[PDB]
Tab-separated table of C-alpha atoms in Angstrom:
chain	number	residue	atom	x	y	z
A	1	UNK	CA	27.556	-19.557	-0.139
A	2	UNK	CA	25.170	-17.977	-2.566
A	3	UNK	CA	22.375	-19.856	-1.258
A	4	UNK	CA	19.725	-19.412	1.426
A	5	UNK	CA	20.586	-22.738	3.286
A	6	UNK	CA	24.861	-22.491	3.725
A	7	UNK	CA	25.997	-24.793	1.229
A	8	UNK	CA	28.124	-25.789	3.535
A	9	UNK	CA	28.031	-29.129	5.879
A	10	UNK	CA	28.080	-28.577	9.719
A	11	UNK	CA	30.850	-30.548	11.592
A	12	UNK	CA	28.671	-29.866	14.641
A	13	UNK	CA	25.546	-30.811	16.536
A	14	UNK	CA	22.555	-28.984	18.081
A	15	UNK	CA	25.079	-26.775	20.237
A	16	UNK	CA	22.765	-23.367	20.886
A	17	UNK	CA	21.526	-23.242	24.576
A	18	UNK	CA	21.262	-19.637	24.782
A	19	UNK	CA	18.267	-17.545	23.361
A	20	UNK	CA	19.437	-14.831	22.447
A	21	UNK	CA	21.323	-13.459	19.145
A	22	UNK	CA	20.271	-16.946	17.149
A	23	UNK	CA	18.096	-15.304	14.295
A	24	UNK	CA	20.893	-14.078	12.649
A	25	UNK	CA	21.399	-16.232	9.634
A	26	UNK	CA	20.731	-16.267	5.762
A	27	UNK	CA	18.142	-18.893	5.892
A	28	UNK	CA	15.627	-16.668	8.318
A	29	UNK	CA	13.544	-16.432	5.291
A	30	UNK	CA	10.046	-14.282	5.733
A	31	UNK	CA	9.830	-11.220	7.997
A	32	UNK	CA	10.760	-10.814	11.904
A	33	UNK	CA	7.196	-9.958	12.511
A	34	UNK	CA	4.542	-10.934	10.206
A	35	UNK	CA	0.619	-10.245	9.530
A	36	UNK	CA	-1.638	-12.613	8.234
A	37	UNK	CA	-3.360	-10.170	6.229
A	38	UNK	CA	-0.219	-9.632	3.763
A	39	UNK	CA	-0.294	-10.131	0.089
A	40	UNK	CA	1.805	-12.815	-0.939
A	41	UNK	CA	3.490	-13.469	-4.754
A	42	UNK	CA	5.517	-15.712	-6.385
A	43	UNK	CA	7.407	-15.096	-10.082
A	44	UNK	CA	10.071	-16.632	-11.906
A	45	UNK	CA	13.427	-16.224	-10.420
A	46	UNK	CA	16.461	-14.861	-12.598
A	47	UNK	CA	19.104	-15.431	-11.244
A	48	UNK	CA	19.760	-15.153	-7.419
A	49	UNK	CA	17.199	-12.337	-5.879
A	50	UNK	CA	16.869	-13.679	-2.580
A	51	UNK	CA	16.761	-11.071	0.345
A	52	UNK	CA	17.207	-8.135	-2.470
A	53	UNK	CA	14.826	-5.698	-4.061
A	54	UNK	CA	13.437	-6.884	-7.342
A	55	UNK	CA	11.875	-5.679	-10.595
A	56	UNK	CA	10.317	-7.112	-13.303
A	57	UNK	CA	12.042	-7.926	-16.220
A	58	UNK	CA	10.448	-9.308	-19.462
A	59	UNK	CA	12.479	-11.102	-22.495
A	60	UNK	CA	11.547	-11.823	-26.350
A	61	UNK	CA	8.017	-12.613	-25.853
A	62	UNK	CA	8.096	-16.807	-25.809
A	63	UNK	CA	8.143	-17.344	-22.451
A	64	UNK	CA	6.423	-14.940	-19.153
A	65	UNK	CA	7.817	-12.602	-17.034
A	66	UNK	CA	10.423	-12.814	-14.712
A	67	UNK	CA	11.947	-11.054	-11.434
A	68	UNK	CA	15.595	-9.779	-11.203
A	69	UNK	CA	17.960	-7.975	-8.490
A	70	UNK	CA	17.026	-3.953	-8.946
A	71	UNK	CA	15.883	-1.470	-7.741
A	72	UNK	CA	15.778	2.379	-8.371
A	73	UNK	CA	12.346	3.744	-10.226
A	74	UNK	CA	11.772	-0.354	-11.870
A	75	UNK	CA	11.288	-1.411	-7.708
A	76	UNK	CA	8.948	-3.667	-7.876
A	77	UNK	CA	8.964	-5.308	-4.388
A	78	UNK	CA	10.857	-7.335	-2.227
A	79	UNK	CA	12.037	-11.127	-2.262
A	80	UNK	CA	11.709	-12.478	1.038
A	81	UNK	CA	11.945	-16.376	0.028
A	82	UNK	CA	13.374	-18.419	-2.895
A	83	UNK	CA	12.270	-22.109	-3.839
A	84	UNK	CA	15.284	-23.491	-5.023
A	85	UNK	CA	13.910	-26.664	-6.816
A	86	UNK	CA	11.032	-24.937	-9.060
A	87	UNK	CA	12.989	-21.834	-9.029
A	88	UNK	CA	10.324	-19.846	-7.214
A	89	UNK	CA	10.848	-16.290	-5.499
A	90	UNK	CA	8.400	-15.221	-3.586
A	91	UNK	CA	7.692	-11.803	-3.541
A	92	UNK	CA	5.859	-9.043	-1.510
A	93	UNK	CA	4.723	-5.738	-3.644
A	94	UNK	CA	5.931	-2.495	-2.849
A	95	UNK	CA	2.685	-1.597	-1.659
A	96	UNK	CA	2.287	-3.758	0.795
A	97	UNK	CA	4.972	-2.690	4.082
A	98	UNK	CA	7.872	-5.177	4.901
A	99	UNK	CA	9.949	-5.401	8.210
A	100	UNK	CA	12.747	-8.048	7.815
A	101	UNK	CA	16.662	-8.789	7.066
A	102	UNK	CA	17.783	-7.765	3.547
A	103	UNK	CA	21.166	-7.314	1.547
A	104	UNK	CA	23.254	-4.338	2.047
A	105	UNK	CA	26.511	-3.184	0.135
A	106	UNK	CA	29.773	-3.828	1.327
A	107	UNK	CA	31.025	-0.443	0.511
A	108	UNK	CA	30.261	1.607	3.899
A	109	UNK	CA	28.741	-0.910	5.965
A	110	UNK	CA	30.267	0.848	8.883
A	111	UNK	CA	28.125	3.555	8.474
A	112	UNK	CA	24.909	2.128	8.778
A	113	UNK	CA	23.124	3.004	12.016
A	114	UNK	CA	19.471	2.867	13.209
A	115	UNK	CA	17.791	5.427	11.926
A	116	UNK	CA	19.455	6.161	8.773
A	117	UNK	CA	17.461	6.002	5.489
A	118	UNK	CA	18.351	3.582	3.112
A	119	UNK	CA	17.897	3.036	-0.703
A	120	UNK	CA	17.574	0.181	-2.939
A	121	UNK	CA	20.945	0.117	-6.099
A	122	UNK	CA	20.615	-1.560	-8.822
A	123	UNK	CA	21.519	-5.135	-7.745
A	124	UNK	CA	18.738	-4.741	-5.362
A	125	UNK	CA	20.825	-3.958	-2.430
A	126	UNK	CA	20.533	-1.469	0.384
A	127	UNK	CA	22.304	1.542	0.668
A	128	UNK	CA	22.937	4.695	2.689
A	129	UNK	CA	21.482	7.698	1.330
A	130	UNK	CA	15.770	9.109	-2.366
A	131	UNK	CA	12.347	7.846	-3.799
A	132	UNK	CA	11.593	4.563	-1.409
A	133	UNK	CA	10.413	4.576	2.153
A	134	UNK	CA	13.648	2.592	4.026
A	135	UNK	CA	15.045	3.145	7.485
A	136	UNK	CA	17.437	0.802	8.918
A	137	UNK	CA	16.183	-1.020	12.611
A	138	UNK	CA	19.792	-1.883	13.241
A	139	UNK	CA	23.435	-1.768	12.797
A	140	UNK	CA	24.812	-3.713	9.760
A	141	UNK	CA	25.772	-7.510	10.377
A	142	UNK	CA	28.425	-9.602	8.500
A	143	UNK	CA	27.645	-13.071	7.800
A	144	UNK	CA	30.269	-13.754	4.751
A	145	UNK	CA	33.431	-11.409	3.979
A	146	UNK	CA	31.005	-10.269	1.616
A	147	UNK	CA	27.947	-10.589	2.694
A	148	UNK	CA	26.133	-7.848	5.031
A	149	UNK	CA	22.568	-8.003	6.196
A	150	UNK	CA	20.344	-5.177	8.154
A	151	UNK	CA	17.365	-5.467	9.688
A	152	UNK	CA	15.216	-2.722	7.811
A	153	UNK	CA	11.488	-1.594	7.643
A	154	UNK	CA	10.040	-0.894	3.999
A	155	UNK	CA	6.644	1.514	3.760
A	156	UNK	CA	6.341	2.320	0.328
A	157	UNK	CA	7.944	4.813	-1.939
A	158	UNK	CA	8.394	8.543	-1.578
A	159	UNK	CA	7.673	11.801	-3.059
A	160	UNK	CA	10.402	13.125	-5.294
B	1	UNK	CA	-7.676	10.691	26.850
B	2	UNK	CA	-9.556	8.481	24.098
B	3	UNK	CA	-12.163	7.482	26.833
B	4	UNK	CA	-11.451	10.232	30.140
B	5	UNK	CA	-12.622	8.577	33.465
B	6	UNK	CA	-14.636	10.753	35.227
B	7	UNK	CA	-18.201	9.675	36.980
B	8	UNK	CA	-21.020	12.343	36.688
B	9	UNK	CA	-24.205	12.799	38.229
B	10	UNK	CA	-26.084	12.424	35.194
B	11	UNK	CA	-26.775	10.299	31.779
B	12	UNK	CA	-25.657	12.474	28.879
B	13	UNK	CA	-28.298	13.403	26.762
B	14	UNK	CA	-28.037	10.537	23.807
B	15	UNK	CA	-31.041	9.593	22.435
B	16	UNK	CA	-30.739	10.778	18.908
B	17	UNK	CA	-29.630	8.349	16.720
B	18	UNK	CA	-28.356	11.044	14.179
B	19	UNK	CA	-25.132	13.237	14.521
B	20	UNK	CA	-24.037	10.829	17.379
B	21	UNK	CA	-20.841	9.077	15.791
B	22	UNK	CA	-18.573	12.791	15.792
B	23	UNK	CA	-16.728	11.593	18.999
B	24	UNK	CA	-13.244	11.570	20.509
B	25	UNK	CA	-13.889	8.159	21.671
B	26	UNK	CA	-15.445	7.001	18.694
B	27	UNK	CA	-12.282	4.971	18.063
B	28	UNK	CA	-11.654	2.983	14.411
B	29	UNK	CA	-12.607	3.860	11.028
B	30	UNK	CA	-15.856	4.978	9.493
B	31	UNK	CA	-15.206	2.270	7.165
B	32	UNK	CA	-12.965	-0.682	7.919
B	33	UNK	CA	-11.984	-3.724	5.936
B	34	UNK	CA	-11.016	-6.954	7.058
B	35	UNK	CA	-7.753	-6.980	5.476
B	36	UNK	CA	-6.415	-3.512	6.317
B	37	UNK	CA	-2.772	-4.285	8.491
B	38	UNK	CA	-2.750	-2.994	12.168
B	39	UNK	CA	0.233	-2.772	14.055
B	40	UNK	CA	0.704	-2.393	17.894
B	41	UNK	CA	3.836	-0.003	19.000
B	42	UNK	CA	4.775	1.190	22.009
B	43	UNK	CA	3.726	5.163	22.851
B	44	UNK	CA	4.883	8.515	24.016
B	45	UNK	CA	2.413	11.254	24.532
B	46	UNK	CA	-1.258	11.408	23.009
B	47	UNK	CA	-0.999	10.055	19.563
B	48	UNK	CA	-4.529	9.490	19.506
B	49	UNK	CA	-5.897	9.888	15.972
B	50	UNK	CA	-2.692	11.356	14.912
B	51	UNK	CA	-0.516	11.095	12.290
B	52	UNK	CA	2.751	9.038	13.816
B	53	UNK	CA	6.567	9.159	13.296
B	54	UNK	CA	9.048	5.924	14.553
B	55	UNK	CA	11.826	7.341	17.157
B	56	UNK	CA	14.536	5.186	18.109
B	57	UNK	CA	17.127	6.128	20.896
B	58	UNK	CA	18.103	0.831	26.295
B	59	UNK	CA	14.659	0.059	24.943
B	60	UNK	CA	12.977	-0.826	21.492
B	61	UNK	CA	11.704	2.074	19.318
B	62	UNK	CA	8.196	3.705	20.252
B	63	UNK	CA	6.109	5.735	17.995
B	64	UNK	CA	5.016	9.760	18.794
B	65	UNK	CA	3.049	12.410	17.051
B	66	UNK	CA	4.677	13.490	13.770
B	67	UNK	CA	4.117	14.394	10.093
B	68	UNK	CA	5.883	15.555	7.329
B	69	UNK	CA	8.488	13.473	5.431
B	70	UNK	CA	9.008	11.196	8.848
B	71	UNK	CA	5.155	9.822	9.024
B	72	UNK	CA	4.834	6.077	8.999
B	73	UNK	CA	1.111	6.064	9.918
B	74	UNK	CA	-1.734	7.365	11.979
B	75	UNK	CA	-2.721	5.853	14.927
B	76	UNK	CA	-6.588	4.964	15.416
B	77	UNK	CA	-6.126	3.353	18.620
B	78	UNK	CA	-4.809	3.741	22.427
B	79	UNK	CA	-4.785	1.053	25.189
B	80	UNK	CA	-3.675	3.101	28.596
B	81	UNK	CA	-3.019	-0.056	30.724
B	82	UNK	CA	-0.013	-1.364	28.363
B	83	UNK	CA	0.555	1.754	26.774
B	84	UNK	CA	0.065	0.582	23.346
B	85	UNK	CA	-1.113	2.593	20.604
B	86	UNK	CA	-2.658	0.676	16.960
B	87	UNK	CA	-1.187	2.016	13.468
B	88	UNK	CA	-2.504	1.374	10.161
B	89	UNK	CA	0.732	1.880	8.027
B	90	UNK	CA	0.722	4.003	5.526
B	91	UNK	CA	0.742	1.805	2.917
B	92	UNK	CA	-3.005	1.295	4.116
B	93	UNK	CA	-5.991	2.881	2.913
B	94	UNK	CA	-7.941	4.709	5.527
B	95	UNK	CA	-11.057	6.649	6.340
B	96	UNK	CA	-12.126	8.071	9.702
B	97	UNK	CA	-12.019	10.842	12.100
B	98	UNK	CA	-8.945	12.690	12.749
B	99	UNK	CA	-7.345	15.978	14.564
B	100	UNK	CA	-7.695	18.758	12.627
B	101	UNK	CA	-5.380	22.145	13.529
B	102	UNK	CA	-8.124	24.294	13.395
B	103	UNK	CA	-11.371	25.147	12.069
B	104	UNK	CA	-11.098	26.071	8.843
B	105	UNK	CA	-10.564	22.870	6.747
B	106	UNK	CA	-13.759	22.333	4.573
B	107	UNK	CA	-14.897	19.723	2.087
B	108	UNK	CA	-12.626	18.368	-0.696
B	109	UNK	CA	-9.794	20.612	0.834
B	110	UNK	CA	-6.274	18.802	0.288
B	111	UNK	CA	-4.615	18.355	3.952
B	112	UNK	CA	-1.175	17.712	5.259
B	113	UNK	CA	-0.134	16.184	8.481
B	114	UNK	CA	1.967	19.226	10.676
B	115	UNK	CA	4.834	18.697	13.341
B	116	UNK	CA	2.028	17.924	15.677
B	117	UNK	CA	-0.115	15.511	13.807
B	118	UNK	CA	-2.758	17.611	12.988
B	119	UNK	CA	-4.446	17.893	9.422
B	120	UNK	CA	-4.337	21.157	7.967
B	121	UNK	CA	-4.935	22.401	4.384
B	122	UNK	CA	-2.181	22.778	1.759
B	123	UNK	CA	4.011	20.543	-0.155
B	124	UNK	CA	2.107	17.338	0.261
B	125	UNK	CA	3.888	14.241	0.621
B	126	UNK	CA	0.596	11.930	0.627
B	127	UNK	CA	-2.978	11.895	-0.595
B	128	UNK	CA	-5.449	13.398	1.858
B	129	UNK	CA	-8.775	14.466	1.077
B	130	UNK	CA	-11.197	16.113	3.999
B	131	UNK	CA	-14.664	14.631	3.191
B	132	UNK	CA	-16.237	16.705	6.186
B	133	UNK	CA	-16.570	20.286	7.708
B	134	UNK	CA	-13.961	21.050	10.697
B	135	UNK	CA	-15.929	19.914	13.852
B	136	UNK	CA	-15.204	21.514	16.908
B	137	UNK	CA	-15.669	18.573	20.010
B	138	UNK	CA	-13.777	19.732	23.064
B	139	UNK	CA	-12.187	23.288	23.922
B	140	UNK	CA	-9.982	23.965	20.808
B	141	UNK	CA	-10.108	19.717	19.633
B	142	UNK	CA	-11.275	19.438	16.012
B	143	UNK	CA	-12.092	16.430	14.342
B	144	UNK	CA	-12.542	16.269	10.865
B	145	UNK	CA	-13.205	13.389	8.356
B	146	UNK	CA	-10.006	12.436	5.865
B	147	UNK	CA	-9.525	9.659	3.347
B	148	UNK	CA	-6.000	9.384	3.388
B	149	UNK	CA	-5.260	6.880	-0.044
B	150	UNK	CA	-1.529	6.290	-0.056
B	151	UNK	CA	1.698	9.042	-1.329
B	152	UNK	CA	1.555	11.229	-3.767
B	153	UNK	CA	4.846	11.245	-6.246
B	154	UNK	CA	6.820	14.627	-6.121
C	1	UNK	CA	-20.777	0.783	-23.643
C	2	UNK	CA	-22.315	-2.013	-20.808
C	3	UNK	CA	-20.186	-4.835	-19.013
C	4	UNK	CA	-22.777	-7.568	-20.246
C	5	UNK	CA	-25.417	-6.603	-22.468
C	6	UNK	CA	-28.115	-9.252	-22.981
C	7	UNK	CA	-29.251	-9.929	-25.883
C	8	UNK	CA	-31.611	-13.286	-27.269
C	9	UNK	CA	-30.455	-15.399	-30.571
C	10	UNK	CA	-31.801	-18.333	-32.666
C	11	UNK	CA	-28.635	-19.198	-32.454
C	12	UNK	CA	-26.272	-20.848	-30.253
C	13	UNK	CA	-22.271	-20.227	-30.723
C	14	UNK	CA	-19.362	-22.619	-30.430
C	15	UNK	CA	-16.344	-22.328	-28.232
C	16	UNK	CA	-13.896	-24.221	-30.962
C	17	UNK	CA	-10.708	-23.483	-28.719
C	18	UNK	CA	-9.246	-22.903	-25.440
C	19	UNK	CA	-7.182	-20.471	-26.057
C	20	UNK	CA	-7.431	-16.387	-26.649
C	21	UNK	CA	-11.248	-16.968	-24.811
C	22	UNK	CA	-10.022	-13.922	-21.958
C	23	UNK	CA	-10.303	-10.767	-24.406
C	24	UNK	CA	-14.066	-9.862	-24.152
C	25	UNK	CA	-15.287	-6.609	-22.303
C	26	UNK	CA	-17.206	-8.792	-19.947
C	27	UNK	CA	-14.174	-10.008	-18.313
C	28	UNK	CA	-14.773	-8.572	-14.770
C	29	UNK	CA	-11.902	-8.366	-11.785
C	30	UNK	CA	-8.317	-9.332	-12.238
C	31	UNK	CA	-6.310	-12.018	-13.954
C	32	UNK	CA	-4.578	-12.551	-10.776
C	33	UNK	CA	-6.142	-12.148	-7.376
C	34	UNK	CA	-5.131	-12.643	-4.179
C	35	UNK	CA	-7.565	-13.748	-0.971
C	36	UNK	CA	-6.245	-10.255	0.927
C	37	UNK	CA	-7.120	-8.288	-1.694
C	38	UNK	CA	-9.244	-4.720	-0.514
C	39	UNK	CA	-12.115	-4.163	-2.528
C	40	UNK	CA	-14.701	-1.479	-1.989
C	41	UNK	CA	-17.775	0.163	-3.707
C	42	UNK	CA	-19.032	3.517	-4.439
C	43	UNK	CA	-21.776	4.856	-6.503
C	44	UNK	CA	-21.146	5.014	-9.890
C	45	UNK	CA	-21.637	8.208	-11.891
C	46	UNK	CA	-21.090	7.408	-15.448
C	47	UNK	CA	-19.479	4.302	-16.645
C	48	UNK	CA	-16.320	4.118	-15.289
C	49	UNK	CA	-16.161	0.128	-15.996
C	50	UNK	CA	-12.224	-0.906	-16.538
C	51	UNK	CA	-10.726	2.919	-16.064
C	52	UNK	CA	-8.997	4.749	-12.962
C	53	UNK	CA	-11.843	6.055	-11.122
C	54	UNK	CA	-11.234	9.882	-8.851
C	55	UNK	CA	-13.475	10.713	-5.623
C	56	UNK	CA	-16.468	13.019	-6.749
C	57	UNK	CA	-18.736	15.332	-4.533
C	58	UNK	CA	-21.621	16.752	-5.713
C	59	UNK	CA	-23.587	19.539	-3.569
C	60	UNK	CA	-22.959	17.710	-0.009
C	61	UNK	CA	-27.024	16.627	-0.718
C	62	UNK	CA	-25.893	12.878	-1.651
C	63	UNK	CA	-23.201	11.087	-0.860
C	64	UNK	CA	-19.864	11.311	-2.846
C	65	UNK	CA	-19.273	9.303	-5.963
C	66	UNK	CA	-16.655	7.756	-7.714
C	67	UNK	CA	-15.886	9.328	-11.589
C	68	UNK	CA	-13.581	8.411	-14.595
C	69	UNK	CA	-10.275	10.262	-14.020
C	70	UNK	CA	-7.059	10.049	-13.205
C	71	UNK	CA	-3.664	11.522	-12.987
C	72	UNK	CA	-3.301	13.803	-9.476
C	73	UNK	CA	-6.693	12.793	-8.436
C	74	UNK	CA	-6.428	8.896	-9.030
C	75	UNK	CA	-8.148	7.592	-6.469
C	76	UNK	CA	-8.357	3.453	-7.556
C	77	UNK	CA	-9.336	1.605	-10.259
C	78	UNK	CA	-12.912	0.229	-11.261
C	79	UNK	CA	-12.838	-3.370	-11.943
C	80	UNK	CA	-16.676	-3.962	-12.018
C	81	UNK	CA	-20.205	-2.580	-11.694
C	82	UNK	CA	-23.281	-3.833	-11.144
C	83	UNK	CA	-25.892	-2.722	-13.469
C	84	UNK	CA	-28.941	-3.109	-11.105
C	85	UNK	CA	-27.447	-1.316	-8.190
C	86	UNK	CA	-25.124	1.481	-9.465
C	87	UNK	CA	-22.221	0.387	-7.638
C	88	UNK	CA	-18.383	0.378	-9.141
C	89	UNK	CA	-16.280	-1.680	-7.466
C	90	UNK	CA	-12.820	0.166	-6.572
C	91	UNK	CA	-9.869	-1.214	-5.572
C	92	UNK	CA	-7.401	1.341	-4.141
C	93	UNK	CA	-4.195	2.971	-5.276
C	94	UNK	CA	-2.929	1.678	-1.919
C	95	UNK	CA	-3.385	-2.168	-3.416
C	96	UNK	CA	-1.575	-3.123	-6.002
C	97	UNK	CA	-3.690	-4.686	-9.299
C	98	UNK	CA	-3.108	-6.958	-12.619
C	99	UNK	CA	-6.207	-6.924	-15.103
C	100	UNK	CA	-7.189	-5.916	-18.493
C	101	UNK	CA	-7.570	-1.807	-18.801
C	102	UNK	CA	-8.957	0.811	-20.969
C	103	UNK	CA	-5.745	2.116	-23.039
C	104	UNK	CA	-6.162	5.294	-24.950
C	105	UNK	CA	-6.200	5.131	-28.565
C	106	UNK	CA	2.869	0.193	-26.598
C	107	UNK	CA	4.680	-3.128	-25.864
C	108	UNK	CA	5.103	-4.829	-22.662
C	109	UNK	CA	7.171	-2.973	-20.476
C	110	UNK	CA	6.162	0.150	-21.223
C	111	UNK	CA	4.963	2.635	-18.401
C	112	UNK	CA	1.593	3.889	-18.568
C	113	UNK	CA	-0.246	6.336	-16.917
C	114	UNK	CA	-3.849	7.350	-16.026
C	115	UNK	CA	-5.362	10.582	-18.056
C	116	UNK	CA	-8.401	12.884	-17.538
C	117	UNK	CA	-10.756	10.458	-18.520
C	118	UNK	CA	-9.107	7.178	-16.520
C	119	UNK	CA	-7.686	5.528	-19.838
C	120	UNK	CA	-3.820	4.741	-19.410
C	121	UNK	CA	-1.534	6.242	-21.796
C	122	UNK	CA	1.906	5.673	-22.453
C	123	UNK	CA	4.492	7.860	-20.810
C	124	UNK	CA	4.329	9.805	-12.708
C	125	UNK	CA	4.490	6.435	-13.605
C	126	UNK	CA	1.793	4.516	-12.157
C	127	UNK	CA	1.442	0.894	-14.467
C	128	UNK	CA	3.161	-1.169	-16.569
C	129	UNK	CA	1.895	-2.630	-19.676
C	130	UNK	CA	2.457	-6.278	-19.809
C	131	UNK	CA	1.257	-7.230	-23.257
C	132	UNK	CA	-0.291	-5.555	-26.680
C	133	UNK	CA	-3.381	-3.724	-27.090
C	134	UNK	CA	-6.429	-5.876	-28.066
C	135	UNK	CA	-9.073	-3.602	-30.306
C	136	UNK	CA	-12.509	-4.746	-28.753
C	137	UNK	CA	-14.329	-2.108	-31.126
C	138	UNK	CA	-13.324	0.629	-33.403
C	139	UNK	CA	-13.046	3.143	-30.326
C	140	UNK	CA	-12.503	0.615	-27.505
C	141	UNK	CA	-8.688	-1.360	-27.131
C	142	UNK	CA	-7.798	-2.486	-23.387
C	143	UNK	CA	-4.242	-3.512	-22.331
C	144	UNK	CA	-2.883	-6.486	-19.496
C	145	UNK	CA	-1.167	-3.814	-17.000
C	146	UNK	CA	-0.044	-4.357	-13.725
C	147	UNK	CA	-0.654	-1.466	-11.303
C	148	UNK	CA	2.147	-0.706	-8.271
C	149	UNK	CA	0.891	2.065	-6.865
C	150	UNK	CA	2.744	5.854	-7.922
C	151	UNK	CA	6.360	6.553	-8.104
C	152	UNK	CA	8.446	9.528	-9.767
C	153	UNK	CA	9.350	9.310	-13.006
């Protein structure tokens, strides 16, 4: 469902002999490849931001900031991990370059090839294209009727 | 070639310690921090201390020579054996030695990477300064010193 | 005008409460910092202490400096200096940063950007102000901004 582990019990066992094609699931939180030299943050979650583009959204003043689904010119980075209990996403700045599975719309999914530059919406989902540094690594993949993830590298925005 | 393999019949003149870091081999940064991301990709061509563009086509996607709006990093690095060349993304502050077109980039000149990976004065889609004169090293290879900080909006 | 000027007292002050003890000009580096953070240093010409600092090159004699300034030129931000040596420490556009900065004499969530002389001013967007403006003198107020690097608008 709308969570990074399925909330959904498995009538099965440990049934995966094969190697190949098993990374792609919701819960492969964190990028495919990963440096140790990345800068790391965690914020507030509102909402459900996992695996989407996020920006920072403030309220009355009482209480600190917070981190929603966007995108657009209020991208602030990227949530690559949620904690569910303390309600924790973890997020890596725009500055710093991502490589990983993320969200894309279900409107076109077909279309999506390697190669093709992507943008962020404003729920923080991918989509074919104009001011951030996206190109899709693969072809779109559908783990829900409605939900679609693609393996894309992020380097920062772009002029114009 | 970053280091070319030839034996001579001589030592090269070298005892100088000043004006002796203006190399082709002279691989790296000027100035390097521990923290600063390097990534490995697999090569086609001479990338060497080049500005680099992803191609994908079975095999994975390599990197080439590039600029412009498709440049995802310059390459400081080449290992020949495993054909492997190091990137420092462009999301990375840099400073070092790089291919220059020709010789007539001078200091504090704004540059932009070309077609070929070259620097060449100003259009610009990221923030290169030249901190160095145009320095001519092999028959028409110049090298000149950039600080390359990042994009640079519209 | 200095980070930490030292001056002597008869006196000694009292620290009655825990709170609001963060708003003094002597408040060096960021409120938030992270271990893989890039910091550098340059020579300092001027004071360029809590402002957007710009690369500066004099006659090619000496080696180029770092100078208050901002806008196409913004080259990082100054988040301390030593006084003894003459050296600003810069952290680069490239890095993303969260600390107290010069404002020009604005709520949080308002975009700011870097003028001339390296204060940020409300609307390139380059920071976002995350609280009020805190006078520190009659010509001095610095703002909690968080720094993502440049985008267009």
């Amino acid at each position: 469902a709308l969570m990074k582990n399925p909330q959904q019990d498995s009538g099965l066992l440990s049934n995966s002999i094969d190697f190949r094609d098993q990374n792609l699931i919701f819960s492969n939180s964190g990028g495919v490849c990963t440096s140790s030299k990345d800068k790391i943050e965690n914020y507030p979650a509102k909402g459900y931001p996992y695996k989407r583009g996020v920006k920072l959204s403030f309220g009355d003043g009482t209480t600190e900031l917070e981190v929603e689904a966007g995108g657009g010119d209020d991208l602030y980075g990227v949530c690559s991990d949620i904690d569910e209990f303390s309600g924790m996403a973890t997020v890596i700045p725009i500055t710093n370059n991502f490589t990983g599975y993320l969200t894309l719309k279900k409107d076109g999914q077909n279309g999506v090839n390697p190669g093709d530059k992507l943008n962020f919406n404003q729920h923080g989902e991918l989509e074919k294209v104009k001011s951030v540094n996206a190109i899709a690594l693969s072809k779109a993949h559908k783990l829900t009727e409605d939900l679609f993830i693609v393996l894309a590298s992020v380097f920062g925005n772009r002029a114009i | 070639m970053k280091n070319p393999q030839h034996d001579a019949s001589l030592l090269s003149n070298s005892n100088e310690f000043r004006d002796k870091n203006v190399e082709f081999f002279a691989s790296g940064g000027t100035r390097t921090s521990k923290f600063d991301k390097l990534e490995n990709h697999p090569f086609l061509g001479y990338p060497y201390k080049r500005g680099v563009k992803r191609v994908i086509q079975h095999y994975e996607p390599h990197v080439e020579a590039g600029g412009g709006e498709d440049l995802y990093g310059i390459c400081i690095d080449i290992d020949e054996f495993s054909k492997t060349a190091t990137i420092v993304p462009i999301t990375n502050n840099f400073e070092g030695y790089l291919v220059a077109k020709d010789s007539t980039v001078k200091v504090k000149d704004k540059l932009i990477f070309n077609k070929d990976g070259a620097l060449e004065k100003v259009k610009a889609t990221i923030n290169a300064t030249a901190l160095t004169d145009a320095k001519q090293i092999s028959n028409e290879v110049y090298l000149v010193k950039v600080a390359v900080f990042g994009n640079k909006a519209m």
